[PDB]
Structures are given as C-alpha cells and as structure tokens.
Design an enzyme around this catalytic site. Sequence first.
Site, PDB file in Angstrom:
ATOM      1  N   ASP A  19     -35.913   8.085 -32.437  1.00 20.06           N
ATOM      2  CA  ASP A  19     -34.515   8.119 -32.021  1.00 20.06           C
ATOM      3  C   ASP A  19     -33.576   8.076 -33.218  1.00 20.06           C
ATOM      4  OD1 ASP A  19     -35.859   7.939 -29.653  1.00 20.06           O
ATOM      5  OD2 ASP A  19     -35.120   5.942 -29.116  1.00 20.06           O
TER       6      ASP A  19
ATOM      7  N   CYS B  63     -32.816  21.285 -29.006  1.00 18.28           N
ATOM      8  CA  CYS B  63     -32.843  19.829 -28.971  1.00 18.28           C
ATOM      9  C   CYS B  63     -31.601  19.316 -28.258  1.00 18.28           C
ATOM     10  CB  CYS B  63     -32.933  19.250 -30.386  1.00 18.28           C
ATOM     11  SG  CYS B  63     -31.554  19.668 -31.487  1.00 18.28           S
ATOM     12  N   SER B  64     -30.847  18.437 -28.912  1.00 16.62           N
ATOM     13  CA  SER B  64     -29.565  18.001 -28.375  1.00 16.62           C
ATOM     14  C   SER B  64     -28.506  19.059 -28.656  1.00 16.62           C
ATOM     15  CB  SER B  64     -29.159  16.652 -28.974  1.00 16.62           C
ATOM     16  OG  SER B  64     -29.103  16.720 -30.389  1.00 16.62           O
ATOM     17  N   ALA B  65     -27.873  18.976 -29.830  1.00 18.90           N
ATOM     18  CA  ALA B  65     -26.877  19.974 -30.204  1.00 18.90           C
ATOM     19  C   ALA B  65     -27.526  21.292 -30.602  1.00 18.90           C
ATOM     20  CB  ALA B  65     -26.007  19.447 -31.343  1.00 18.90           C
TER      21      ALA B  65
ATOM     22  N   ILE C 181     -28.982  21.886 -33.859  1.00 18.63           N
ATOM     23  CA  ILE C 181     -28.734  22.190 -35.264  1.00 18.63           C
ATOM     24  C   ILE C 181     -29.585  21.288 -36.149  1.00 18.63           C
ATOM     25  CG2 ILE C 181     -26.460  23.243 -35.070  1.00 18.63           C
ATOM     26  CD1 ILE C 181     -25.174  20.616 -35.174  1.00 18.63           C
TER      27      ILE C 181
ATOM     28  N   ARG D  44     -32.682  18.649 -35.473  1.00 19.80           N
ATOM     29  CA  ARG D  44     -34.123  18.808 -35.314  1.00 19.80           C
ATOM     30  C   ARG D  44     -34.491  20.267 -35.079  1.00 19.80           C
ATOM     31  NH1 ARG D  44     -35.058  13.866 -30.932  1.00 19.80           N
ATOM     32  NH2 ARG D  44     -33.831  12.277 -32.043  1.00 19.80           N
TER      33      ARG D  44
END
Length: 519
Positions: free
Chosen positions: A410, A444-446, A448, A450
């Site tokens: 995390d 992933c999340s955004a 950019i 990971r």
Amino acid sequence: MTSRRWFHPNITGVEAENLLLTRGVDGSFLARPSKSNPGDFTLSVRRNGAVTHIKIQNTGDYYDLYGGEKFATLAALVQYYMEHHGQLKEKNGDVIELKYPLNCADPTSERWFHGHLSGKEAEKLLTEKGKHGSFLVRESQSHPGDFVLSVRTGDDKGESNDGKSKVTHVMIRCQELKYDVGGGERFDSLTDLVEHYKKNPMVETLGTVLQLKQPLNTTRINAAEIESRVRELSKLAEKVKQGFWEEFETLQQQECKLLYSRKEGQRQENKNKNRYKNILPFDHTRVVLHDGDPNEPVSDYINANIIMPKSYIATQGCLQNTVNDFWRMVFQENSRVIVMTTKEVERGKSKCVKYWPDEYALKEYGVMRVRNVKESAAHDYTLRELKLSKVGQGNTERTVWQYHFRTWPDHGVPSDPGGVLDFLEEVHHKQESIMDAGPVVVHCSAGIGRTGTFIVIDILIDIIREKGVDCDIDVPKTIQMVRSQRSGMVQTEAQYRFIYMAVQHYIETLQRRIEEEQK
Ligand SMILES: CC1(C)CC(Nc2nc(-c3cccc(-c4ccccc4)c3)cs2)CC(C)(C)N1
C-alpha cells in the site's frame, strides 16, 4: 517557458522561508522535496508578509495536494493553480495565489552539468561518448569556484578520420553569484548562461561556432554492466549525493518538455469519465473508441494512452460508468492480456471497481459479454481466463487473460523484484503465445505510477530477453520516452530505483541460468 526553475532540489525548509521573504513578494512560491517525509513535497508560498507551507504527498500513484486536487506531474500542478486562480484556498476560505515562480540557481538537475570533472576526463568523454554539438559543464580545477564549458565541434558526425573534429574549452568565471564568459552579460545561473548561448552560440575569430546542441550521455549503459552502475548510484553523500536521487531529479527537470494537450479529457461530456479529474490522457496517443453511428451518443473517450516503444495500453482503474467503455477498448484493440497492479480496494479507498464477472459467471456490459472461465490462484497474482464476446453477434469470442497482481504494498514499492519479474515472465509468455494479440492493457489507480513502473520494467526486459545481455539500455530515456505518451509515467523515486533493482535482479538470473547450462 518550461521552466521548472521554481523547484529547488537541495533546499531546507528554513532556507525556502528566507528565500521568499528577501527575494520574493506576496504571490511568490517554490516547490521543494520535503525534509520531513522522503515521499512528501512542500509548496512554500509567500502569503501576506509570511510564508505558507502547503505539502504534497506522493505514495506512487499521484501528487496529492492538501486542500487541493491530484496531479500526474508536479509541473501540471503549477500550470493548473497558476491558470486557475480561485481554486487554491485555505478554507477558512482565504485564497492562496500562485503568481510568481521564484527560480533556482542550482544546476545539479541539468543533463549537461557534471559536478566534479577534469579537462582530460571531460575531453575523454566528449570524444568517446560524444558527437558534434555535445557539450558539458564541469567544475573548474585550477581556478576554484568556477566552471568550464566543454563543447565538441566535429567533422559533422565526427566519427572516422581525425583533424577536423575539435573540443573547445570555455572558462566560466563565477563572481558575486553571477556567471559569465569573462565578458559581456552576467547570468543568474548556469542554466540562464547555457540557455542563452544555446540560442546565441559563441563565435571566435576565424568564425567557428560552438553549437550547444545536445548534452552528453552518462546514462546509456551496457545491460551486462548494470550491477556496477547500480553500485555507483547507491553511494550516498548529501558534496552529493544519492546517485539514484540526483539522476531521477534530472529526469524530473525534463518533465515540462512534455506538457502536451489533453483537451479531449477536459470536455464537460467526459468530466465524470476520469477517476481523477486533472489526470488525463494525451490527445495524440489516446485510445479512440469506435461505437459507430449512434446509438446516442456513441462517444469515443476513455482515460487510456497507447504506449509504443510489443505495445501497451496504460489506462485507469475502471469507474462505474466506464466499465462498458473499458470492454469496448479491449475488444477493438484486440487485447488479450490485462495487467491489474492494484487491489479492488487499498487502504479503505476504492481504486478500481470489479469489471470482471465472478468465477463461472457470464455478464453483459452493454454491447460486450464477458465469461469468467477459470481463476488460477498463485501467490503475488491471480490469473483469470475470460472470454470476451459481442452481444447479439457471433465470431466475436476471444480469450482474455487478466493478470491481477495482489501483493504490491500500500505504501511504496516491494522489497524484492523477484515477484514482479516472475509475474512479468508469465505475462510476456502468455502474450507472445497468441499471434497478433493487441497491446497489453496495464492499469492501476490513476494509471501512471505502478502502471508506468510495470511497463518500463517490461520494456527493458523485452530488450534484454531478445538482444541478449550485451545490449545498451537507458532507463531515464526509457522513462522519458514513455512519459511523452502518457503524462507522468513512473511517479516516485522509489518506483524509479525499483526499476534499476528489477533489471539488475533479472540480469543475475540470466547469467546464473547460462552458467548452470554449462555446469
Ligand atoms: C553528469 C551526471 C552524472 C549525469 C547527468 N545526465 C543525466 N541525464 C538524464 C536524462 C534524463 C532524461 C532523458 C535523458 C536522455 C538520454 C538520451 C537521449 C535523450 C534523453 C537523459 C538523467 S541523468 C545529470 C547529472 C547532473 C545528475 N550528473
């Protein structure tokens, strides 16, 4: 107007306090790496006679501004809050204005700077690792505190034969902060000096011009010699520094040369189609959907950029209203492998919704239909055999292999690249096993951090697995090249250092494998 001079790489929290009070006025600001937290970033702004220190965090996904919005590059954060004057508020409701970027004189984040270097060593690098127009700025040996500009003027190409190539040393005297060529204009920094003569080239009698075309190239290394290069970037002394940190901050100082237009994502119709409102895809590399004749309103937008050095697709974590468009992208691009580098929910905040059906289930996402055939449960990841088809149509069924990495921490990056390297090795073999499969969908999340870190590691391995161990790899040039296709690929230094450790750990296994084949 790049300029990223408002970023001071080697600065204290108290020095920024004094720098704004003496050389700045109300509205002057600067960005600095926070002393307190190695991942934090502080935006110090002179606000009514005093300085306000607003901090920006970055765990490996985005730059999160407190009392503000999230961004992909620290430069686009400044570009946003300088063209949007009434969005940065203290709340209390008092606005904090970004009007005057206070520049920096430290040249350590410039590609042409070299720190300690000597004439013979500098001239040796300009003929070995050089070219017509290559130039560097080193520390002066004889006269202390000064600098020496070393520029090579060659045969044109300058290779083969000898006599018409030349290296010209130029003295740069430093006196009372300012720099000069011993005459003429006095500049505030080496950059202002270098930038000036890159547009007004120096000319000597007999009419030779010292074109400051491109800097040198300390970066491109042979893939076999990486274990010695990682050793150099690891020694710490910060007159400087952590080699990974000095190299990465040089890469960051080139990021505003990639402020490409992302206006197709700024449209009102596509407002809620982005997980993060200010992190958008480049218009010239965005994935354009082809719904066809409406079917109102068809729409062609998805927060995804095509990555091409095998190609890739770097997208965002699916939103509720974008799951349909996601499976349209996988179908039209003929993608067969999906890399998911995020859990369904991390640290309580949802970063991606479940867009796949449960095991043995069939689900329709508008025009597309997905079947979950099997779920393999290894450790570090989970493989899902999915069948993607188009509702109401035949001969559209294709097998999509979704790889879901589950053991990314995390906070920060993993401690051993073996998990990612083994994960990518299975992902690559599955991709190569399908003829003319589309790009690899990584998200992933955004999309950019990971997502960019996984792709860059895969790009460097694809070069090594093919061309072998005796091939040239260049990581910042690889990062920068991908950053020109999606804004802000590879976020933090931790992800950047992990890319070196991954390639290093990958070379050792190859060498150990080759030796074991020779007993
Ligand atoms: C001289 C040395 C050791 C290396 C210098 N050169 C560097 N260039 C880069 C870099 C970053 C992005 C792109 C490129 C690049 C390389 C090849 C072709 C085009 C761009 C180089 C990272 S470090 C920088 C500093 C001042 C830190 N010291």
